[PDB]
Structure 1
Amino acid sequence: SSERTFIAVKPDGVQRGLVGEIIARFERKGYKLVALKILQPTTEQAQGHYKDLCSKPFFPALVKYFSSGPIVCMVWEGKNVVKSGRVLLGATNPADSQSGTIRGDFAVDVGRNVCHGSDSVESAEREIAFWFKADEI
């Protein structure tokens, strides 16, 4: 109903001109866009995104990539939008993703994988609050 999810087109996804493609697939699914913007994330913001990999190898490499160019931030809304989001995006690692999904169709690298989606309603609410102010939504 009023369930929401966060979708981000990463710098590689924007540079490859995949923004419209991704938006269109959520539109085709019948979902509603209630927040949308473009920004080059700050180092502090990228760190926040990969927050739980803080103590893993080459965490700065990921932060660097994530803030290397503008991304497109989105909030979609509708029944089961979070689950639909991962169905549409496909497996996080393109090696496991199948054809017909975003990563299946366009992604190869597991680091630079074109886009991100919340994996839960839990993570969604956190992610949306981080990138958007309440008035933007």
Structure 2
Amino acid sequence: MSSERTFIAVKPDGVQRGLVGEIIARFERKGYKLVALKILQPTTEQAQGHYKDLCSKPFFPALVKYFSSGPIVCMVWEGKNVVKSGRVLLGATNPADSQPGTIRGDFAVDVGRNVCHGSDSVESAEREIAFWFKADEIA
């Protein structure tokens, strides 16, 4: 379906390093349609809710602290097969596994600093979109 949607975020390292435009540009070049957009610094509560499945893991406090350390950019992209293509564009979540040509492949080294997040599935996309955006924020 052409109306498939995904959630993409530029993380605080990606924003600090001036990678917002580059990421957005790669999605535009790919041919996908931006339908929602905002910049904000996550609260602790937001960072914890985002990483809620991993809340029992020992590296969780560092993830939450880092994620809430500065502004992120939230996006929603629309188009056919946009979820899978989004993940492919960002590259393997561990930059050590990422291919050049991808966002993480080109720009990231450390997994706790992997620049940007993309939904891993349609269910996850729906959850993340609903988490970060009210329905009325989506154009």
Q: What's the CA shift string for 1:22-51, capped at 9, x where partnerless?
A: 000000000000000000000000001111
> What is the CA–CA distance in structure 1 between the aligned matches of 2:79 and 2:9, rounded to whole Å?
17
Aligned residues: 137
**Structure with greater helix share of residues:** 2
Q: What's the CA shift string for 1:80-131, capped at 9, x where partnerless?
A: 0000101100000000001000000000001110000000001000000000
> What is the CA–CA distance in structure 2 between the aligned matches of 1:98 and 1:118, rounded to whole Å?
19
Q: What's the CA shift string for 1:44-93, capped at 9, x where partnerless?
A: 00001111110001211110000000000000000000001011000000
> What is the CA–CA distance in structure 2 between the aligned matches of 1:49 and 1:13, rounded to whole Å?
17
> What is the CA–CA distance in structure 1 between the aligned matches of 2:10 and 2:75, rounded to whole Å?
8
Q: Equivalent pairs: percent with the same residue?
A: 99
Unaligned segments of structure 2, at least 5 residues: none
Unaligned segments of structure 1, at least 5 residues: none
TM-score (norm 1): 0.99
The runs of 4+ residues in structure 1 deviating greater than 2 Å are none
